[PDB]
Design a protein around this ligand. Structure first.
Ligand SMILES: COc1ccc(Nc2nc(NCCc3ccccc3F)nc(Nc3ccc4ncccc4c3)n2)cc1OC
Ligand SMILES: COc1ccc(Nc2nc(NCCc3ccccc3F)nc(Nc3ccc4ncccc4c3)n2)cc1OC
Lengths: 36, 265, 36, 265
């Protein structure tokens, strides 16, 4: 029957610590779309 | 790789808001003393409700959006039991709370919000993203009282084809969803008009005692205006609240709308 | 925040009583795909 | 419209199988005395688990499929609290139960199932449908012991683009899903090889004490064969169990495979 698979919660998303004080990547959508 | 987020990186304070799968807390990052909102979601509850897929869309989409009117998702991390979202802080709370204090907004406040949101949406739609859950609750407020959309759990990158997922919120649902038809970016425009109405009036146009009745009303575009709603406002809402999605205006038409330009600041 | 909308359970699917004794429609997929 | 299904149209008997949201019952339609399986799902529980969207895909897809190897969905109806699915009856129960009685299947039984399923899948894939949940549990048996796939809740009509939904079942999951990549119809071929293995061996190739370990194994295509598995069988599984989806054979290649033709009946 139907069941829900456990996810590993590893997302194509930022997990990198960032140094807040202080400091181009929205192309992610165009690149992810352009995959054949 | 590089240094990764840790719970031990944040000093926690007051809970900003409660939610079904956990709360948002006022958070400070230690090294910088920088003010954040840490959203804490429990995996057991996300999986029980079968919404981790929605959680993945939020994280993967929101975090790759940059707009002064879209609440930032700086990044995410997780442990054994929870998922953490590191979100920009919005000092002036939700628009929903503001609306509850004032009962309704004047034309200047409304048109300004509807600009700031139409800009945020314009950016999304340019990246081929549909938000699908526009509503006062999902709208926050920055330092200078700027509108910030958040809550991207129902959002979706739809670069080529239409979508089929019945989603959103009762009063804000587009008719094409109710009638079980495929949908496109034009759903954000529908809910943008239901927003504009509720902003000016204090309640949404198809509100009823049952979800069944609301559904009929939205399907039929069955609503009236109170006497105080100006011709200008009436025009815009009527245009956004078209039953046929392709008859709704582009956001560029909303931004240049005579009533928007004559009241927006 | 996030919520789940109640469905009306009206599906593009057969609800018509059928007379079992006794008695072309898989084009549904090609037609649903061919929508512009 | 026309006369619509009613609960009062069916005489109910023994429960054929229990499930999370309700059971399947041996059912008879009164006017014809015709034998059916009535599946009874509770709306409260479907909505709690957030799976009505999956329920809609099952009903909308399965009911428009016609194949002697795909369990029929004659139609559906609902009341205030439940959803009913009127499904073809499969007298010889599940393939999973058969496997449990015999510990493992011989080459003749396996190759025949794998033909009957490959035919059913070939038909789906021609209608641009991906089943996404191939496993012994989702496989039933007809009057002459014919294989019938069912349980179409994770299925999807994907006519143009790839899909992103992480779904299926632990031991049968394709690696592209585990690695968080978009997927296509080639996921049914992967699970078809994991099926073929489990059929011949009695357990699936990446089975482990934890889902974490299984995930690593599938990702790495980490598995071995017992000594009794013939060269022919070894070849087919190895071909279906490719990490790169585009390196998996078409179903037409499976149907014409020397070991399939030499054992299928
Ligand atoms: C982003 O995720 C969430 C967003 C907002 C909330 N809810 C919330 N509720 C209240 N009052 C409660 C009234 C109320 C009661 C019942 C229903 C709705 C409702 F609004 N105040 C606030 N304030 C702020 C202020 C700044 C923020 N900056 C960043 C992020 C969040 C922020 C929230 N938020 C919860 C969320 O996740 C659980
Ligand atoms: C289609 O939806 C379902 C399909 C099958 C089942 N489960 C089931 N379990 C058993 N033994 C129980 C062993 C067992 C125990 C724990 C887990 C798995 C498992 F298999 N026997 C059967 N027999 C039959 C026979 C003919 C049928 N004809 C038409 C439709 C169904 C039929 C089911 N079915 C349930 C479903 O929905 C809830």
């Amino acid at each position: 029957g139907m069941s829900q698979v456990k996810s590993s919660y590893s997302y194509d998303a930022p997990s990198d610590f960032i140094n807040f004080s202080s400091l181009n990547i929205d192309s992610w959508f165009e690149e992810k779309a352009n995959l054949e | 790789g590089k240094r990764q987020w840790a719970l031990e990186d944040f000093e926690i304070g007051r809970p900003l808001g409660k939610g079904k799968f956990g709360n948002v807390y006022l958070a400070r990052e230690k090294q910088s003393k920088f003010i954040l909102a840490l959203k804490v979601l429990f995996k057991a509850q996300l999986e029980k409700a079968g919404v981790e897929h929605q959680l993945r869309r939020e994280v993967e989409i929101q975090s790759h959006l940059r707009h002064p009117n879209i609440l930032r998702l700086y990044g995410y991390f997780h442990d054994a039991t929870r998922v953490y979202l590191i979100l920009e802080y919005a000092p002036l709370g939700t628009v929903y709370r503001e609306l509850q204090k004032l009962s309704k907004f004047d034309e200047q406040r409304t048109a300004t919000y509807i600009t700031e949101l139409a800009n945020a949406l314009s950016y999304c739609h340019s990246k081929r993203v549909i938000h699908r859950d526009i509503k006062p609750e999902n709208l926050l407020l920055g330092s200078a009282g700027e509108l910030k959309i958040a809550d991207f759990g129902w959002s979706v990158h739809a670069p080529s084809s239409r979508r089929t997922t019945l989603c959103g919120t009762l009063d804000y649902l587009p008719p094409e969803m109710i009638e079980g038809r495929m949908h496109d970016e034009k759903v954000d425009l529908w809910s943008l008009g239901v927003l504009c109405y509720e902003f000016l009036v204090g309640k949404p146009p198809f509100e009823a005692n049952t979800y069944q009745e609301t559904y009929k009303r939205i399907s039929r575009v069955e609503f009236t205006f109170p006497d105080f709603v100006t011709e200008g406002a009436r025009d815009l809402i009527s245009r956004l609240l078209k039953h046929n999605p392709s008859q709704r205006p582009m956001l560029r038409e909303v931004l240049e709308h005579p009533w928007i330009t004559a009241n927006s600041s």
